[PDB]
Design a protein around this ligand. Structure first.
Ligand SMILES: *[C@@H]1O[C@H](CO)[C@@H](O[C@@H]2O[C@H](CO)[C@@H](O)[C@H](O)[C@H]2NC(C)=O)[C@H](O)[C@H]1NC(C)=O
Ligand SMILES: *[C@@H]1O[C@H](CO)[C@@H](O[C@@H]2O[C@H](CO)[C@@H](O)[C@H](O)[C@H]2NC(C)=O)[C@H](O)[C@H]1NC(C)=O
Ligand SMILES: *[C@](O)(c1cccc(CSCc2c(C)nc3cccc(F)c3c2N)c1)C(F)(F)F
Ligand SMILES: *[C@](O)(c1cccc(CSCc2c(C)nc3cccc(F)c3c2N)c1)C(F)(F)F
Ligand SMILES: *[C@@H]1O[C@H](CO)[C@@H](O)[C@H](O)[C@H]1NC(C)=O
Ligand SMILES: *[C@@H]1O[C@H](CO)[C@@H](O)[C@H](O)[C@H]1NC(C)=O
Lengths: 532, 532
């Protein structure tokens, strides 16, 4: 049978699913590790022990335990990201969409979801891989990984909760794809990992980590970079938050053993309930449990690894959306609301910058404020709002990614950069939020090809080009069709720094993506904060 | 006789001079102090002892001893500022142009020349007061004052060379105008002092100095402000340069008395020859001997005097020219020359910023550089050149003046601000220098009304409006004709901050003159340099 695949962990049975008036196979909920429950909670994952019989892979698996957004009950804009399956610590599974008839050896794409390292699911409707597997003829995999304290509690030195275990979950799923994807018609020497936000940062972390470099061929990073200020913490800061988490649950705190023991007896929801109480600052865009710079997964600081070329050398395709600050300002800064235009007062403007650059002293907060204020119109509410969106997005996503691409390109084998700014025709979030985080995922996964979703024809066309760029790049290291007639996405070089806009209009090539602001965030502000 | 005036210091005899096909009287070279020669060198000036007979006031007096520009022999652009009379320490005289027939009691205007406190003359062709006395029916006075070491050598504590004596020379001439201008038909209760560059800064210093406030009614400041970073030094820095000047002339240095004694035996040219060797930094736009913040002429720091309203409350009219950096960059920064377009390399751009902000540490030099560099085109030679012009002009003239006007306006009785940007039709300096320092003096003094000078008709028209604005303001505290039909120059208020452009086109009103850059120079850079 075409839905029966024999793998090294055992036999797996899929299900035929319909797609755009045709059908493909889907193997959902394949386990790739032992359930990390009980005394295994916080521990490195272990490989799934082979099984006898046939694993029923016809339905989505549980989603990892995580914070659930309840800010807008009923609003599809936020609910679409929440877990859509029961939550469970038993959640280490992966999903595979396979073209039909079964390929013999084709390009494999492995999706890594975002969610700030504190949430995320591989089973969301926006991540359904059938449209892309089907259209681009690729075997599409989406993996899963522990988030929150479950995936990132870090007591460096201890082997019981060493940190980075969520990164090891991703790695294990990639090891499983490397070892078994051939049986699904996938080419293991051509796997491209790709992900967005924390997923984009994770992709970059596997590029840096010696232990992960050999499990894939190429990478795509969307609105996420490994050096993002919210993506990692030192071992000391991780230890500090683990202890603080412990203090919030009345734990015995005088040994890592007592602390861990205590945390392991607590129900998932008890950890999730106080997880935000451990942040060191009153901040925005900062998450409690994230990767730690431990000397193992990451041998040295990310910046020195980047400077010395200590990373996998291959091709990468990456980019950002125009409005990377909107979402977090809405959720956490004063003056913003979902149902108003959110014009921001000078007073809220400054409270916002304070929330956005937590680690800044006053001279630093003054530098950011000077840098983004138009002093001829300092009380313009729209300018203040838009200014904050740029500050949050530049500082947290755009400038860290521009720093990463410029550093990577000096040693890599090819870089392609994009700036996605298509203005949705079907606004679900208010208009002031602009081209919000994740809106491009809809095109990468080809949702515009389904009529019942109401996208414009030009959006369907945009979706097909994006999907073909991603897939062609995954197959070859180049998003462009060899000798095609379409406009050529240029390679980004350390000298000319070209990138393209990604929207419904004729491709336009630009240079030095947001250099003016990024020289401020990557060069000036840091030197200033270090002097003072 | 109309050319014979009897004053409190004695009888004075003038000369009839022709002007625009008519004639007025001129009393040139009237002495207002004892010659500050010999043991009087460096000392406070003393009042001129009355004389018997008739003082021949028919020819210009000597010019004070000073550095002579020889950078461009023959070039009229530079030669026009050099002394045009014998130089002599015996130089404390004033000139008066009086309408004919003699007024009974009219508006008096007193001109104070610029020259960085190290040079300047009241006898230059650009300062000939006949066109303005004649056209606006004002009694026009130009005074003179000691410059360089002769006027500003400062050994605070000593009564032999206390500092600020050049400022006391100006004051004495104003005391003489206050006491005698009635005999020339001048109204002593309506004297407006006005000056440019160091002359503009001096005007502001008389506004601050309790000892000078009662000698005049109103003030006009052009490209000069009392708080300009080059306009004053602390008593310690003045003492330091006096000692260093002494060391350059082999003086006995162990007592102010020995030092002064030594400096007094030296010929004028010996002091002028080493005067530039005492600057503390490799700088641009810094002069050796300038006013000192001594606790007398200035009771406390200029900034605290400005904050507390410790200054004369009256009306003021002031402004800048578009290109206040050109002249000093030409003379002192690498990459600039008079006969090339002076496109500036990135390398010279940074050497220039270094020369322009002498007192800056590296984080500071980085802040200026970030602030004026367009990172999408960092190697554009024209942008780099123009960027330097803005840095020099903003830092040295525009931003200090904007700080002064905003502070003054909080307590003053009326402020009028201008931004002069007329593009000369008769370029004498290269075009890249733009609307250079002092080009507006030509219009204030009405040179465009004389045909042999070749100005365009619209320039003659501009000259007549400027002269009438200055004169009407001097007469009334308002540059505008009561109920006129011409566009109204608006009052500058702390709230709306309006100013006008001054050029050959229809008056255009703007707001917040260069706020963006001046918030950087007046607020951010200083806080940064103080932290670090
Ligand atoms: C990616 O790597 C390949 C191979 O390592 C590079 O191709 C080589 O290019 C150099 C110079 O053009 C030639 O001397 C070799 O003959 C090429 N080798 C092969 C197998 O083609 C290629 O230039 C790299 N691309 C980028 C963007 O760095
Ligand atoms: C300059 O000062 C004059 C007088 O000190 C101000 O005129 C006074 O204005 C207030 C409010 O309009 C009145 O109560 C007085 O009756 C006025 N006095 C006179 C003599 O007119 C004038 O407002 C000031 N102008 C500016 C620009 O500050
Ligand atoms: C990233 O992983 C990230 C980026 C943007 C939002 C979040 C919040 S958590 C789940 C989620 C995601 C991944 N994307 C969204 C896009 C738009 C609106 C949303 F509500 C939404 C949501 N919830 C996480 C990082 F956090 F690293 F920025
Ligand atoms: C000011 O007093 C000043 C401003 C500009 C130049 C100088 C140099 S000294 C004599 C002089 C003056 C007053 N103005 C000029 C304008 C244009 C070209 C010139 F060559 C020139 C000259 N020499 C002094 C201060 F120094 F304070 F900036
Ligand atoms: C797999 O599970 C689904 C739903 O739980 C069920 O309908 C289907 O029949 C199962 N297949 C087998 C053979 O277990
Ligand atoms: C004044 O001086 C000028 C030139 O030195 C001379 O021509 C003129 O006659 C003098 N007048 C008197 C009366 O001294």
């Amino acid at each position: 049978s075409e839905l029966l695949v024999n793998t090294k962990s055992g036999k797996v049975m899929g299900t035929r699913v319909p797609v755009l008036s045709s059908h493909i196979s889907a193997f959902l909920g394949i386990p790739f590790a032992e359930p990390p429950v009980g005394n295994m909670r916080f521990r490195r994952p272990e490989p799934k022990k082979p099984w006898s019989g046939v694993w029923n892979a016809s339905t989505y698996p549980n989603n990892c335990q995580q914070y659930v957004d309840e800010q807008f009950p009923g609003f599809s804009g936020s609910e679409m990201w929440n877990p859509n399956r029961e939550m469970s610590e038993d959640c280490l599974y992966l999903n595979i969409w396979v073209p039909s008839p079964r390929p013999k050896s084709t390009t494999v794409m492995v999706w890594i979801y975002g969610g700030g390292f504190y949430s995320g699911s591989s089973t969301l409707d926006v991540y359904n891989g059938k449209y892309l597997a089907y259209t681009e003829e690729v075997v599409l995999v989406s993996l899963s990984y522990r988030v929150g304290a479950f995936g990132f509690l870090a007591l460096h030195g201890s082997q019981e909760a060493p940190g980075n275990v969520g990164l090891l979950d991703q790695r294990m799923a990639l090891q499983w794809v490397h070892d078994n994807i051939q049986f699904f018609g996938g080419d293991p020497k051509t796997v491209t990992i790709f992900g967005e936000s924390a997923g984009g940062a994770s992709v970059g972390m596997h590029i840096l980590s010696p232990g992960s470099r050999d499990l894939f061929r190429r990478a795509i990073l969307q609105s996420g970079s490994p050096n993002c200020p919210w993506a990692s913490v030192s071992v000391a800061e991780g230890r500090r938050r683990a202890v603080e988490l412990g203090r919030n649950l009345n734990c015995n705190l005088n040994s890592d053993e007592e602390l861990i023991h205590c945390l392991r007896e607590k129900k998932p929801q008890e950890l999730i309930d106080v997880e935000w109480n451990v942040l060191p600052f009153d901040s925005i865009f900062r998450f409690s449990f994230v990767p730690v710079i431990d000397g193992e997964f990451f041998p040295t600081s990310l910046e020195s690894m980047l400077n010395s070329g200590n990373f996998k050398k291959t091709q990468i395709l990456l980019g950002v959306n125009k409005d990377e600050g909107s979402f977090f300002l809405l959720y956490g800064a004063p003056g913003f609301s979902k149902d108003s235009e959110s014009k921001i007062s000078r007073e809220d403007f400054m409270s916002g910058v304070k929330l956005s650059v937590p680690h800044a002293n006053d001279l630093g907060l003054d530098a950011v404020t000077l840098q983004y204020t138009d002093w001829m119109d300092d009380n313009n509410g729209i300018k203040n709002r838009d200014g904050l969106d740029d500050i949050v997005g530049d500082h947290n996503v755009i400038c860290p990614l521009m720093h990463f691409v410029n550093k990577y390109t000096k040693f890599g084998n090819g870089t392609y950069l994009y700036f996605f700014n298509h203005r949705a025709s079907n606004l679900v979030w208010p208009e002031w939020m602009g081209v919000i985080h994740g809106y491009e995922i809809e095109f990468v996964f080809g949702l515009p090809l389904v009529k019942e979703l109401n996208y414009t024809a030009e959006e369907e066309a945009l979706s097909r080009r994006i999907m073909h760029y991603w897939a062609t790049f995954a197959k070859t290291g180049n998003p462009n069709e060899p000798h095609s007639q379409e406009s050529k996405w240029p390679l980004f070089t350390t000298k000319e720094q070209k990138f393209i806009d990604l929207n419904t209009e004729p491709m336009k090539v630009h240079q030095r993506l947001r250099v003016q602001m990024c020289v401020f965030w990557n060069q000036f502000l840091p030197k200033l904060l270090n002097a003072t």
